[PDB]
Amino acid sequence: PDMKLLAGASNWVNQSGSVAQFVFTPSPTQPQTYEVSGNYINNAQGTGCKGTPYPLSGAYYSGNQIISFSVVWSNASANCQSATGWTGYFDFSGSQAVLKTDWNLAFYSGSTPAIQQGQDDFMQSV
Amino acid sequence: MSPDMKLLAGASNWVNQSGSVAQFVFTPSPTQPQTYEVSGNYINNAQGTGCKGTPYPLSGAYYSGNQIISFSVVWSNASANCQSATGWTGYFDFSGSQAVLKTDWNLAFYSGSTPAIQQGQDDFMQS
Ligand SMILES: O=C(O)CCCC[C@@H]1SC[C@@H]2NC(=O)N[C@@H]21
Ligand SMILES: O=C(O)CCCC[C@@H]1SC[C@@H]2NC(=O)N[C@@H]21
């Protein structure tokens, strides 16, 4: 039901300590739909490309507060030659807003490609 | 022209095992090296799903160093609205005889008041 989300640059911390900041811009073509921009700071132990902002991009559907966004792990600080996409939904029914996602992370190990699966639960950082 | 270059050269059509079609457009990222913003349209043909047979915008990001991509569709247009969204992530495999885009996907949706996220996999080949 959520215009504070749509109007701001809100912040979301996951169970690994990473932080997602989202910005929404109305789609020129799709109703109730928004272009997602912002940045992602990865703090997940055992991963690369930690501690610096990476741009994120995706799409958000305001009808039932569902989102899908992606980061390519390439910036001025570090390049992990990989990308992640998250897809899930927001739940504002509790005293703390939560984002529940599943993610895939495509990467290479030498010449071998792979896609790792996982789940990120974020809570809003008011 | 190498297969990773044909991809960027203009618009390409990629077709998955369900008969769905992804049309990718690339333009250079404003801030990230070796990265492209992904735009285009997705026409769905998957059995047992909604929103079939019309174009939906797609958006995402592409890493050109090893041809890895992640893109999403919100299933809202002038024809149908499925109140859902899908994100695909994967890689372009140019090693075999024909190119395959290999992906995992997640589809977020509601069944009444219960939210869920469905997993699957799509392999896309050139048209
Ligand atoms: O190691 C890499 O290839 C780049 C960084 C990966 C970070 C992953 S993305 C999914 C999961 N959620 C996080 O916040 N961090 C990890
Ligand atoms: O039924 C819906 O909620 C909207 C259409 C979903 C189509 C899914 S997205 C993943 C998979 N790949 C396809 O090409 N079609 C299905």
UniProtKB/Swiss-Prot annotation, chain A:
- List, for all copies, the residue spans of the domain called Avidin-like: 4-126
- Could you say what the effect of mutating P55C is? This mutant forms a disulfide bridge stabilizing the octamer and preventing dissociation into dimers upon biotin binding
What Gene Ontology terms describe what this protein does at the molecular function level? biotin binding; protein homodimerization activity
Q: How is it used?
A: The specific properties of hoefavidin make it an attractive target for novel biotechnological applications, including drug delivery, nanotechnology, and molecular labeling.
Q: How does activity depend on temperature?
A: Is hyperthermostable. Displays a Tm value of 84.9 degrees Celsius, which increases to 96.2 degrees Celsius upon biotin binding.
* Location (main, coarse): secreted
GO CC list = extracellular region
Free-text note on domains in this protein's UniProt record = The C-terminal segment plays a key role in the formation and stabilization of the octameric configuration, since the short afifavidin (lacking the last 5 amino acids) is only dimeric.
Q: Which family does it belong to?
A: Belongs to the avidin/streptavidin family.
Q: Subunit comment for this entry?
A: Exhibits a dynamic oligomeric assembly: the apo form exits as homooctamers, which dissociate into homodimers upon biotin binding. The X-ray structure of the intact hoefavidin reveals unique crystal packing generated by an octameric cylindrical structure wherein the C-terminal segments of each monomer are introduced into the entrance of the biotin-binding site of an adjacent non-canonical monomer.
Return the protein name. Hoefavidin
What's the source species for this entry?
A: Hoeflea phototrophica (strain DSM 17068 / NCIMB 14078 / DFL-43)
Source taxonomy: Bacteria, Pseudomonadati, Pseudomonadota, Alphaproteobacteria, Hyphomicrobiales
Curated annotation (Swiss-Prot), chain B:
Key words of the record: Biotin, Disulfide bond, Secreted, Signal
On temperature dependence, the record says: Is hyperthermostable. Displays a Tm value of 84.9 degrees Celsius, which increases to 96.2 degrees Celsius upon biotin binding.
Q: What is its main location?
A: secreted
Indicate where this protein resides in the cell. Answer: Secreted
Q: Name one GO molecular function term.
A: protein homodimerization activity
**Effect on the protein upon substituting P57C:** This mutant forms a disulfide bridge stabilizing the octamer and preventing dissociation into dimers upon biotin binding
Q: Answer whether the UniProt record assigns the keyword Secreted to this protein.
A: yes
Q: Where does biotin bind?
A: N16, S20, Y42, N44, G50, S84, T86, D122
Keyword Transcription regulation listed? The answer is: no
Instruction: List the record's Gene Ontology CC terms alphabetically.
Output: extracellular region
* Avidin-like domain segment(s): 6-127
> What are its applications?
The specific properties of hoefavidin make it an attractive target for novel biotechnological applications, including drug delivery, nanotechnology, and molecular labeling.
* Paired cysteines (S-S): C51-C82
What's the entry's take on its domains? The C-terminal segment plays a key role in the formation and stabilization of the octameric configuration, since the short afifavidin (lacking the last 5 amino acids) is only dimeric.
By sequence similarity, the record places it as follows: Belongs to the avidin/streptavidin family.
Q: How does it assemble?
A: Exhibits a dynamic oligomeric assembly: the apo form exits as homooctamers, which dissociate into homodimers upon biotin binding. The X-ray structure of the intact hoefavidin reveals unique crystal packing generated by an octameric cylindrical structure wherein the C-terminal segments of each monomer are introduced into the entrance of the biotin-binding site of an adjacent non-canonical monomer.
What does it do?
The exact role played by hoefavidin in the host organism is still obscure. Forms a strong non-covalent complex with biotin and 2-iminobiotin.
List the protein's name.
Hoefavidin
Q: Which organism is it from?
A: Hoeflea phototrophica (strain DSM 17068 / NCIMB 14078 / DFL-43)
